[PDB]
Amino acid sequence: PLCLKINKKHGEQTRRILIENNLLNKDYKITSEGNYLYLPIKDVDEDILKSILNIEFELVDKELEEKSFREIISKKYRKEIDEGLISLSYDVVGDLVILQISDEVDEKIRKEIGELAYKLIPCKGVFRRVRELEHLAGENRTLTIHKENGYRLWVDIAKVYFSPRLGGERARIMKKVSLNDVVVDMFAGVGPFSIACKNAKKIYAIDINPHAIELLKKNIKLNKLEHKIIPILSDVREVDVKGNRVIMNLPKFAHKFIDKALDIVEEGGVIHYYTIGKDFDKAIKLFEKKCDCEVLEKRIVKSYAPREYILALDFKINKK
Numbered sequence: 001p002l003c004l005k006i007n008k009k010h011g012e013q014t015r016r017i018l019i020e021n022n023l024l025n026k027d028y029k030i031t032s033e034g035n036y037l038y039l040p041i042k043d044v045d046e047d048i049l050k051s052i053l054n055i056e057f058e059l060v061d062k063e064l065e066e067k068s069f070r071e072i073i074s075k076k077y078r079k080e081i082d083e084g085l086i087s088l089s090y091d092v093v094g095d096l097v098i099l100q101i102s103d104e105v106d107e108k109i110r111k112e113i114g115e116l117a118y119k120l121i122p123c124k125g126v127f128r129r130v131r132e133l134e135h136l137a138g139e140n141r142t143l144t145i146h147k148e149n150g151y152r153l154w155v156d157i158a159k160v161y162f163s164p165r166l167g168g169e170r171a172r173i174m175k176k177v178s179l180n181d182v183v184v185d186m187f188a189g190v191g192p193f194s195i196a197c198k199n200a201k202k203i204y205a206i207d208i209n210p211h212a213i214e215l216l217k218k219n220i221k222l223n224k225l226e227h228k229i230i231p232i233l234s235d236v237r238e239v240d241v242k243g244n245r246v247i248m249n250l251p252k253f254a255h256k257f258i259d260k261a262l263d264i265v266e267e268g269g270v271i272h273y274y275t276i277g278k279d280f281d282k283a284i285k286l287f288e289k290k291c292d293c294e295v296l297e298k299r300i301v302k303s304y305a306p307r308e309y310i311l312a313l314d315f316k317i318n319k320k
C-alpha cells in the first residue's frame with residue numbers, strides 16, 4: 001500500500017536503514033520494477049525520512065501481495081476499533097498478555113475479549129489498561145519473568161514500568177558496551193538496560209520507584225551480576241555517580257534531565273538519549289546548545305501517537 005520508491009542501486013544500503021529504524025513493513029514482498037525497489041513501509045512523515053536518507057526517494061501507494069487474533073477482532077469489531085476504545089496492538093510480558101481497552105465498555109463484553117484472547121494467544125494471564133490494570137482472562141497474577149536477548153527479567157506489570165517492545169533497543173546497546181565502560185542507567189526500571197550492558201565493568205542502576213529496585217535486585221541476582229551492577233534507589237537527580245555511558249530510558253521526560261546526565265558523564269562519553277517528536281531537531285538543538293556534542297547515531301524507535309515517534313539519539317559529549 002505505502003511503499004518507498006528508490007533507485008535499486010541503494011537497495012540494500014537503504015533496506016538496512018529502514019530496518020534500523022523499525023520502519024520496513026514485513027507484511028509485503030519488496031518488489032522490483034525496472035531500476036526501482038519498492039519497500040513496504042510503515043506510515044511516515046516525508047520530512048523525518050529526509051533526515052535519515054541521503055538519497056532521493058518517494059512515498060507512493062503501490063499494490064503489493066502478502067508475504068492471529070488481531071484478525072478476528074479487527075473484522076468483528078470495527079465498530080469500536082474505529083474510535084479508540086480498542087487497539088489492534090497488545091504487548092506480551094513473560095506469559096502475561098496486556099490489552100489496550102477503554103473504561104467505556106461493559107466488562108461483560110470487555111472481559112470476553114480477554115477470555116477469547118487467552119485462546120488465540122499463548123499466555124497464562126490477560127489484563128488491559130505505569131497505570132492501573134484489569135484482570136480479564138487466564139491466571140490472576142501480575143508478577144512474571146520476561147525473556148529477551150538471552151537474559152531474563154522479573155516483572156510485576158502492575159507495580160513497575162516495563163516495555164517489551166524495547167528489547168530491540170537493548171540488543172543494539174548490548175553491542176556497543178565495551179569492557180572498560182562505566183554505565184549510569186538513569187531510569188533503570190526492573191533493569192532491562194543494566195543487564196543488556198554486562199560487558200561493562202561497572203553499572204549504576206538508578207530508579208526512584210522502590211518496586212523497580214526490589215525486582216532489579218532479583219534480576220541482578222538471577223543473571224549473576226552482583227559484582228557488576230550497583231543498584232540505587234532514589235530520584236536520579238540527587239545521585240552523584242560518574243560514567244562514560246549514560247542511558248536515559250524515559251522518552252516522555254528525558255529532556256528535563258539532560259543537565260543532570262551531562263553532569264554525570266565524562267568528556268568523551270556517550271549519552272544514549274530517548275525522547276519523543278516528529279523530527280530530531282528539537283532534541284538536537286537542546287543538546288547542541290547545552291554542550292559541544294556530536295551525534296553518533298540516530299534511530300526511530302517506534303510510533304507513539306499519529307506521526308509522533310519515540311526517537312533515539314546517541315550523543316558524544318566532546319567537551320562539557
Ligand SMILES: Nc1ncnc2c1ncn2[C@@H]1O[C@H](CO)[C@@H](O)[C@H]1O
Pocket residue numbers: 160161162186187188189190206207208209212234235236237249250
Ligand atoms: N526522577 C527519576 N529518578 C529515578 N527514576 C525515575 C525517575 N523518574 C522516573 N523514574 C523511573 O523510570 C522508570 C520507567 O522508565 C520507572 O521505574 C520510574 O520510577
Ligand SMILES: [Zn+2]
Pocket residue numbers: 009010011013014055
Ligand atoms: Zn547507496
Ligand SMILES: [Zn+2]
Pocket residue numbers: 104
Ligand atoms: Zn468515548
Ligand SMILES: [Zn+2]
Pocket residue numbers: 159211214
Ligand atoms: Zn514489590
